[PDB]
Scaffold this motif. Structure first.
Motif, PDB file in Angstrom:
ATOM      1  N   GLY A 107      42.278  11.298 -46.178  1.00 46.12           N
ATOM      2  CA  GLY A 107      41.662  11.214 -44.870  1.00 46.12           C
ATOM      3  C   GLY A 107      40.812   9.963 -44.862  1.00 46.12           C
ATOM      4  N   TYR A 108      39.797   9.974 -44.003  1.00 42.42           N
ATOM      5  CA  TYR A 108      38.896   8.835 -43.752  1.00 42.42           C
ATOM      6  C   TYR A 108      37.750   8.681 -44.739  1.00 42.42           C
ATOM      7  CZ  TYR A 108      41.642   8.618 -39.611  1.00 42.42           C
ATOM      8  OH  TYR A 108      42.732   8.510 -38.805  1.00 42.42           O
ATOM      9  N   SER A 109      37.642   9.607 -45.681  1.00 37.42           N
ATOM     10  CA  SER A 109      36.500   9.655 -46.599  1.00 37.42           C
ATOM     11  C   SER A 109      36.567   8.531 -47.639  1.00 37.42           C
ATOM     12  CB  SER A 109      36.362  11.031 -47.294  1.00 37.42           C
ATOM     13  OG  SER A 109      37.488  11.325 -48.115  1.00 37.42           O
ATOM     14  N   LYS A 110      37.726   7.893 -47.798  1.00 38.44           N
ATOM     15  CA  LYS A 110      37.843   6.794 -48.753  1.00 38.44           C
ATOM     16  C   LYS A 110      38.051   5.480 -48.037  1.00 38.44           C
ATOM     17  CE  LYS A 110      37.286   9.513 -52.175  1.00 38.44           C
ATOM     18  NZ  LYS A 110      37.372  10.682 -51.303  1.00 38.44           N
ATOM     19  N   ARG A 111      37.088   4.571 -48.158  1.00 40.63           N
ATOM     20  CA  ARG A 111      37.059   3.302 -47.423  1.00 40.63           C
ATOM     21  C   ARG A 111      37.495   2.125 -48.277  1.00 40.63           C
ATOM     22  NH1 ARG A 111      34.114   3.531 -42.580  1.00 40.63           N
ATOM     23  NH2 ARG A 111      33.241   5.643 -42.223  1.00 40.63           N
ATOM     24  N   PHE A 112      38.609   1.494 -47.920  1.00 39.40           N
ATOM     25  CA  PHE A 112      39.123   0.327 -48.656  1.00 39.40           C
ATOM     26  C   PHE A 112      38.884  -1.009 -47.966  1.00 39.40           C
ATOM     27  CE2 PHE A 112      41.573   1.595 -52.449  1.00 39.40           C
ATOM     28  CZ  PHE A 112      41.678   2.963 -52.307  1.00 39.40           C
ATOM     29  N   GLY A 113      38.340  -0.974 -46.750  1.00 35.81           N
ATOM     30  CA  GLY A 113      38.209  -2.200 -45.944  1.00 35.81           C
ATOM     31  C   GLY A 113      37.364  -3.359 -46.482  1.00 35.81           C
ATOM     32  N   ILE A 114      37.734  -4.591 -46.126  1.00 38.92           N
ATOM     33  CA  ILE A 114      36.716  -5.639 -46.196  1.00 38.92           C
ATOM     34  C   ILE A 114      35.980  -5.687 -44.880  1.00 38.92           C
ATOM     35  CG2 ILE A 114      37.658  -7.107 -48.007  1.00 38.92           C
ATOM     36  CD1 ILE A 114      38.859  -8.894 -45.879  1.00 38.92           C
ATOM     37  N   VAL A 115      36.438  -4.873 -43.945  1.00 34.09           N
ATOM     38  CA  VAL A 115      35.739  -4.683 -42.668  1.00 34.09           C
ATOM     39  C   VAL A 115      35.465  -3.201 -42.541  1.00 34.09           C
ATOM     40  CG1 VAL A 115      35.972  -4.766 -40.094  1.00 34.09           C
ATOM     41  CG2 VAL A 115      36.739  -6.664 -41.504  1.00 34.09           C
ATOM     42  N   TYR A 116      34.188  -2.827 -42.332  1.00 35.01           N
ATOM     43  CA  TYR A 116      33.784  -1.446 -42.119  1.00 35.01           C
ATOM     44  C   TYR A 116      34.127  -0.978 -40.698  1.00 35.01           C
ATOM     45  CZ  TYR A 116      30.488   2.616 -42.195  1.00 35.01           C
ATOM     46  OH  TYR A 116      29.932   3.870 -42.174  1.00 35.01           O
ATOM     47  N   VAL A 117      34.601   0.252 -40.591  1.00 28.52           N
ATOM     48  CA  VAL A 117      34.858   0.850 -39.299  1.00 28.52           C
ATOM     49  C   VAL A 117      33.965   2.073 -39.105  1.00 28.52           C
ATOM     50  CG1 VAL A 117      36.489   1.978 -37.700  1.00 28.52           C
ATOM     51  CG2 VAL A 117      37.268   0.084 -39.165  1.00 28.52           C
ATOM     52  N   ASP A 118      33.158   2.044 -38.063  1.00 25.50           N
ATOM     53  CA  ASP A 118      32.351   3.199 -37.716  1.00 25.50           C
ATOM     54  C   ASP A 118      33.177   4.075 -36.796  1.00 25.50           C
ATOM     55  OD1 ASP A 118      30.809   5.080 -36.369  1.00 25.50           O
ATOM     56  OD2 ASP A 118      29.109   3.747 -36.043  1.00 25.50           O
ATOM     57  N   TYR A 119      33.632   5.227 -37.284  1.00 25.51           N
ATOM     58  CA  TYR A 119      34.603   5.956 -36.524  1.00 25.51           C
ATOM     59  C   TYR A 119      34.023   6.661 -35.314  1.00 25.51           C
ATOM     60  CZ  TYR A 119      37.732   5.047 -40.501  1.00 25.51           C
ATOM     61  OH  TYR A 119      38.502   4.480 -41.536  1.00 25.51           O
ATOM     62  N   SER A 120      32.697   6.766 -35.194  1.00 25.05           N
ATOM     63  CA  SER A 120      32.166   7.369 -33.972  1.00 25.05           C
ATOM     64  C   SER A 120      32.311   6.399 -32.797  1.00 25.05           C
ATOM     65  CB  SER A 120      30.719   7.884 -34.145  1.00 25.05           C
ATOM     66  OG  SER A 120      29.863   6.864 -34.620  1.00 25.05           O
ATOM     67  N   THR A 121      32.158   5.092 -33.054  1.00 21.67           N
ATOM     68  CA  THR A 121      32.279   4.041 -32.022  1.00 21.67           C
ATOM     69  C   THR A 121      33.516   3.108 -32.118  1.00 21.67           C
ATOM     70  OG1 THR A 121      30.949   2.448 -33.323  1.00 21.67           O
ATOM     71  CG2 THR A 121      29.699   3.877 -31.771  1.00 21.67           C
ATOM     72  N   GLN A 122      34.191   3.099 -33.265  1.00 21.71           N
ATOM     73  CA  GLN A 122      35.349   2.181 -33.515  1.00 21.71           C
ATOM     74  C   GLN A 122      34.832   0.769 -33.701  1.00 21.71           C
ATOM     75  OE1 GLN A 122      38.305   2.651 -34.334  1.00 21.71           O
ATOM     76  NE2 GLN A 122      38.459   4.883 -33.953  1.00 21.71           N
ATOM     77  N   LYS A 123      33.515   0.645 -33.766  1.00 23.99           N
ATOM     78  CA  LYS A 123      32.936  -0.653 -34.091  1.00 23.99           C
ATOM     79  C   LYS A 123      33.270  -1.125 -35.507  1.00 23.99           C
ATOM     80  CE  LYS A 123      29.426  -0.943 -30.604  1.00 23.99           C
ATOM     81  NZ  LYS A 123      28.216  -0.202 -30.204  1.00 23.99           N
ATOM     82  N   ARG A 124      33.598  -2.418 -35.614  1.00 26.22           N
ATOM     83  CA  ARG A 124      33.908  -3.105 -36.864  1.00 26.22           C
ATOM     84  C   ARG A 124      32.643  -3.801 -37.311  1.00 26.22           C
ATOM     85  NH1 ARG A 124      38.177  -0.404 -35.148  1.00 26.22           N
ATOM     86  NH2 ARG A 124      40.165  -1.589 -35.201  1.00 26.22           N
ATOM     87  N   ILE A 125      32.373  -3.781 -38.619  1.00 27.05           N
ATOM     88  CA  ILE A 125      31.322  -4.582 -39.211  1.00 27.05           C
ATOM     89  C   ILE A 125      31.892  -5.309 -40.450  1.00 27.05           C
ATOM     90  CG2 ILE A 125      29.187  -4.510 -40.510  1.00 27.05           C
ATOM     91  CD1 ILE A 125      28.370  -1.881 -38.945  1.00 27.05           C
ATOM     92  N   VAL A 126      31.897  -6.634 -40.456  1.00 20.73           N
ATOM     93  CA  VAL A 126      32.499  -7.339 -41.566  1.00 20.73           C
ATOM     94  C   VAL A 126      31.617  -7.084 -42.803  1.00 20.73           C
ATOM     95  CG1 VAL A 126      33.066  -9.565 -42.580  1.00 20.73           C
ATOM     96  CG2 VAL A 126      33.436  -9.170 -40.076  1.00 20.73           C
ATOM     97  N   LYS A 127      32.197  -6.584 -43.886  1.00 22.93           N
ATOM     98  CA  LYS A 127      31.378  -6.315 -45.078  1.00 22.93           C
ATOM     99  C   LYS A 127      31.069  -7.574 -45.821  1.00 22.93           C
ATOM    100  CE  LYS A 127      33.925  -1.987 -45.614  1.00 22.93           C
ATOM    101  NZ  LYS A 127      34.480  -1.066 -46.628  1.00 22.93           N
ATOM    102  N   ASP A 128      30.116  -7.521 -46.743  1.00 18.80           N
ATOM    103  CA  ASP A 128      29.866  -8.716 -47.549  1.00 18.80           C
ATOM    104  C   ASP A 128      31.130  -9.180 -48.241  1.00 18.80           C
ATOM    105  OD1 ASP A 128      27.330  -8.378 -46.697  1.00 18.80           O
ATOM    106  OD2 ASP A 128      26.406  -8.218 -48.675  1.00 18.80           O
ATOM    107  N   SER A 129      31.956  -8.241 -48.641  1.00 18.86           N
ATOM    108  CA  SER A 129      33.209  -8.608 -49.331  1.00 18.86           C
ATOM    109  C   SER A 129      34.117  -9.459 -48.431  1.00 18.86           C
ATOM    110  CB  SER A 129      33.921  -7.329 -49.772  1.00 18.86           C
ATOM    111  OG  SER A 129      34.561  -6.713 -48.668  1.00 18.86           O
ATOM    112  N   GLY A 130      34.051  -9.178 -47.120  1.00 23.35           N
ATOM    113  CA  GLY A 130      34.754  -9.946 -46.095  1.00 23.35           C
ATOM    114  C   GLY A 130      34.353 -11.414 -46.080  1.00 23.35           C
TER     115      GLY A 130
END
Ligand SMILES: CCCCCCCC/N=C1\OC[C@@H]2[C@H](O)[C@H](O)[C@@H](O)[C@H](O)N12
Length: 442
Positions: free
Chosen positions: A406-429
């Motif tokens: 499910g959504y509990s494991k995050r692999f992104g270099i961009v974070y996704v806030d699933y309540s808003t679908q807002k993207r936040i570029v991570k430091d790794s990004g």
């Protein structure tokens, strides 16, 4: 500490359709087996489904703008078979074709090279009902699906992958039953293995007919297996796990006309009687091998199993997967030594960590950076030693639906806030943007 890659080395990020798109039934799309699997209670953590995911079906343009903003040069993404052919074969869904044409056209406008994975696990439900990968006829269903893709998108997309991780499709999906279609039958699992290969080869053969100036390959999952002791059976256990779990299951067929020796010893009884009649077709020439790599494993002969994994006291990700960077080096050296493919890509490498959005509103994921950096460094060593590695794709661009987790494991270099679908570029990004700009590590 400086490690510069070769001129032209391709730096990318990867996604898969079911994991990010949402809107699985949009615009006449047929159900996939992951729709039905994740809508079955008990199959996925928290009862998560890909109904919404990252809403990439509507947010595709903005997600692509993120790739361009970061300066990343390639995008590996997959196509949902049922969005294109809701019934598996036959009628084409023009709106499905349209969704990917826009992504394709936008990527090229921005100088990003599309790598298209034809199949990344979302088989049409309608074909599952006729047996899915258990059915020998799927080699031709898949041929017709591939042709439709090549005809529609082949003029612009020149880099293609038939199958993402056929071992996982076959074994985790039809033996362990942990992934769709959620089966546990070892005879079905080795017929899937064989039908995956036949499908892959038919698609490559249709590809040569329908696409000019393009390259096609296939992507394998790979673990760095190490022996728990220098006992003979432990050393043998490792050979088996490499032959079975790693690229040789499929590349021995592809380059040599038969399955690996220890796999035949283990599984001849489970394969179709005359499977070897299919090998000359399976040896259809490919242009590149895609290796995904995530983790190292210590292995032992275990009569109650005949191989067991043995947990090591080593650093782990949020999946509990051991972080063993030298593994990506070992697997790169190994593939060249065994099969010497003319071209290789790292088509996935990445890590899940328990990311935190800080009061500053940033996602400081130095742990993911450390993971990626160590692996890229080991990849670099393999190039310095003659491996023809042509590119590196981080898994993933976005946090997403991680299959049975499910959504509990995050692999992104961009974070996704699933309540808003807002993207936040991570430091790794930001870090990875610099890697691309500097073509390496400084
Ligand atoms: C402890 C033994 C289990 C080790 C599992 C190894 C990691 C599995 N690999 C992946 O980890 C994340 C990534 C995605 O699930 C992607 O869609 C797949 O193509 C690929 O399999 N991915």
């Amino acid at each position: 500490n400086v490690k510069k890659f070769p001129e032209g080395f391709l730096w990318g990020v990867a996604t898969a359709s079911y994991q990010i798109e949402g809107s699985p039934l949009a615009d006449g799309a047929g159900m996939s087996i992951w729709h039905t699997f994740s809508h079955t209670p008990g199959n996925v953590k928290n009862g998560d489904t890909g109904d919404v995911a990252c809403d990439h079906y509507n947010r595709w343009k903005e997600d692509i703008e993120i790739i361009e903003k970061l300066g990343v040069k390639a995008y590996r993404f997959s196509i949902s078979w049922p969005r294109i052919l809701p019934e598996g074969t036959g009628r084409v869904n023009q709106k499905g074709l349209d969704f990917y044409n826009r992504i394709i056209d936008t990527l090229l406008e921005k100088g990003i090279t599309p790598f298209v994975t034809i199949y990344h696990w979302d088989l049409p439900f309608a074909l599952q009902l006729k047996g899915g990968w258990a059915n020998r006829e799927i080699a031709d269903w898949f041929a017709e699906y591939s042709r439709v893709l090549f005809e529609n998108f082949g003029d612009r997309v020149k880099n293609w992958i038939t199958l993402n991780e056929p071992w996982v499709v076959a074994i985790v999906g039809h033996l362990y039953g942990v992934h769709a279609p959620g089966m546990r039958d070892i005879y079905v699992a080795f017929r899937a293995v064989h039908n995956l290969l036949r499908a892959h080869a038919r698609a490559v053969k249709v590809f040569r007919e329908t696409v000019k100036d393009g390259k096609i390959g296939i992507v394998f999952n790979n673990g760095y297996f190490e022996p728990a002791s220098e006992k003979e059976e432990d050393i043998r256990a490792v050979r088996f796990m490499h032959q079975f779990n790693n690229y040789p299951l499929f590349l021995n067929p592809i380059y040599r006309g038969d399955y690996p020796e220890l796999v035949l010893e283990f599984a001849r009884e489970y394969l179709p009687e005359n499977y070897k009649d299919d090998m000359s077709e399976i040896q259809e020439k490919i242009d590149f091998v895609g290796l995904n790599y995530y983790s190292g494993h210590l292995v032992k002969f275990d009569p109650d199993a005949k191989v067991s994994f043995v947990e090591r006291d080593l650093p782990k990700t949020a999946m509990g997967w051991e972080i063993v960077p030298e593994g990506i080096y070992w697997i790169l050296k190994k593939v060249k030594e065994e099969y010497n493919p003319p071209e290789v890509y790292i088509t996935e490498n990445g890590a899940a960590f328990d990311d935190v959005v800080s009061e500053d509103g940033r996602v400081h994921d130095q742990n993911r950076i450390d993971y990626l950096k160590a692996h890229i460094g080991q990849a670099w060593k393999a190039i310095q030693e003659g491996v023809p590695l042509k590119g590196y794709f981080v898994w993933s661009l976005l946090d997403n639906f991680e299959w049975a987790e499910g959504y509990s494991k995050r692999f992104g270099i961009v974070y996704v806030d699933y309540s808003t679908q807002k993207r936040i570029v991570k430091d790794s990004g930001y870090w990875y943007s610099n890697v691309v700009k500097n073509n390496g590590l400084e």
